[PDB]
């Protein structure tokens, strides 16, 4: 259990492989995150969403913003794509737990300059993959 | 001779053949490579004799000859030849001890392949040694950059996280149960304290036993 906590070290390795914070190791790390997310799902998505919230709140002044944020948002979002399409298919209810922590970053994404447009497609695909299960939470909010 | 097996933690009565291998495991940690060559010569000569007990079983896997092959795989794992819970745990401890102290990358990879094979093959006894390589795997996942090295590590992690959901029927303390605790203690590096330990006092009585039975 507590030796199996290596998944958090995998999350931290994914942080060190972020462009804002060897590429074969990044590919193997991403593939392992997707492979773990089939069986153990909540820890992987919780870690990745803490990552995306952190990437949202850092480093605005540099050009490192407009290039590394631009790449890293696609990296986090397509890992979320392959995680949600890795067939969890169980509710594990989490209606106000983590999905509420999902949707405010999501409307932070597609609430509203040149770099935004293809991020909107990836966020829309993320919502498309996400709303295959638990329609009731977003229905109650809407 | 009961009392020394309590302190060194290797019981000859529990398993002779694995305990002699566990005694010879510190020969790989010798500073002299000639001693290592003598150690593997001992392992080969013991292998020839334990296969000479059987009929023409030299370099084929059977239970009375598994452990030497473990000690020889640095320089398979059939479930039906042995069918025993203790022997899988003992061989897995032997492999993990051969992992933790060696720093050779080729030996690390050739042991991680057999280890990830054993993770899929034997999930029921795999949480026994799990804390022993917990010290290695945490650094390996964070720092190492060789995909050939990490792929058996990755397979080990996927095998552990898939089969974690069962309660541990064989945990880490199971080694303490049948009197073979501290195999990692004996196979470690030399202490360089150059101090004789306490239990050697008991060994003194061991020697003064033997004389009283053997000259007259």
From Swiss-Prot, chain A:
Domain of life: Eukaryota
Protein name: Neurofibromin truncated
Natural source organism: Homo sapiens
Gene: NF1
From Swiss-Prot, chain B:
Protein localization: Nucleus; Nucleus, Nucleolus; Cell membrane
Record PTM: Ubiquitinated by RNF7/RBX2, leading to its degradation.
Recorded coiled-coil stretches: none
Top-level taxon of origin: Eukaryota
Tissue-by-tissue expression: Detected in brain, peripheral nerve, lung, colon and muscle.
Disease: Neurofibromatosis 1: A disease characterized by patches of skin pigmentation (cafe-au-lait spots), Lisch nodules of the iris, tumors in the peripheral nervous system and fibromatous skin tumors. Individuals with the disorder have increased susceptibility to the development of benign and malignant tumors.
Main function: Stimulates the GTPase activity of Ras. NF1 shows greater affinity for Ras GAP, but lower specific activity. May be a regulator of Ras activity.
Assembly with partners or alone: Interacts with HTR6. Interacts with SPRED2.
UniProt comment concerning the protein's domains: Binds phospholipids via its C-terminal CRAL-TRIO domain. Binds primarily glycerophospholipids with monounsaturated C18:1 and/or C16:1 fatty acid moieties and a phosphatidylethanolamine or phosphatidylcholine headgroup. Has lesser affinity for lipids containing phosphatidylserine and phosphatidylinositol.
Name assigned to this protein: Neurofibromin
Organism: Homo sapiens
Gene name of the encoded protein: NF1
Full protein stretch here: 2371 to 2744 of 2839
């Amino acid at each position: 259990h507590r030796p199996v906590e290596w998944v958090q070290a995998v999350v931290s390795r994914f942080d060190e492989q972020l462009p804002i914070k060897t590429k074969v190791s990044t590919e193997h790390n991403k593939e392992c995150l997707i492979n773990i997310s089939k069986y153990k799902f909540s820890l992987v998505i919780s870690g990745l969403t803490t990552i995306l919230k952190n990437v949202n709140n850092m480093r605005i002044f540099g050009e490192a913003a407009e290039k590394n944020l631009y790449l890293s948002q696609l990296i986090i979002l397509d890992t979320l794509e392959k995680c949600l399409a890795g067939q969890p298919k169980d509710t594990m209810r989490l209606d106000e737990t983590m999905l509420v922590k999902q949707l405010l970053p999501e409307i932070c994404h597609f609430l509203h300059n040149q770099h935004a447009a293809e991020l909107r497609n990836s966020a829309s695909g993320v919502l498309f993959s996400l709303s295959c299960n638990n329609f009731n939470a977003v229905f109650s909010r809407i | 001779c009961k009392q020394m097996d309590h302190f060194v933690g290797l019981n000859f009565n529990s398993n002779f053949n694995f305990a002699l291998v566990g005694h010879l495991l510190k020969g790989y940690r010798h500073p002299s490579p000639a001693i290592v060559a003598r150690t593997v010569r001992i392992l080969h000569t013991l292998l020839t004799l334990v296969n000479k007990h059987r009929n023409c079983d030299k370099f084929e896997v059977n239970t009375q000859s598994v452990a030497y092959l473990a000690a020889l795989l640095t320089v398979l794992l059939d479930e039906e030849v042995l069918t025993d819970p203790k022997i899988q745990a003992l061989l897995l401890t032997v492999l993990a001890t051969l992992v933790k102290y060696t720093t050779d990358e080729f030996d690390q990879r050739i042991l991680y392949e057999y280890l990830a094979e054993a993770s899929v093959v034997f999930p029921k006894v795999f949480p026994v040694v799990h804390n022993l390589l917990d010290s290695k795997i945490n650094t390996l996942l964070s720092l190492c950059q060789d995909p050939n090295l990490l792929n058996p590590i990755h397979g080990i992690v996927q095998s552990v996280v898939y089969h974690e959901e069962s309660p541990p029927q064989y945990q880490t303390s199971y080694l303490q149960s049948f009197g073979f605790n501290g195999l990692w203690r004996f196979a470690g590096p030399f202490s360089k304290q150059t101090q004789i330990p306490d239990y050697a006092e008991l060994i003194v009585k061991f020697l003064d036993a033997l004389i009283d039975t053997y000259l007259p």
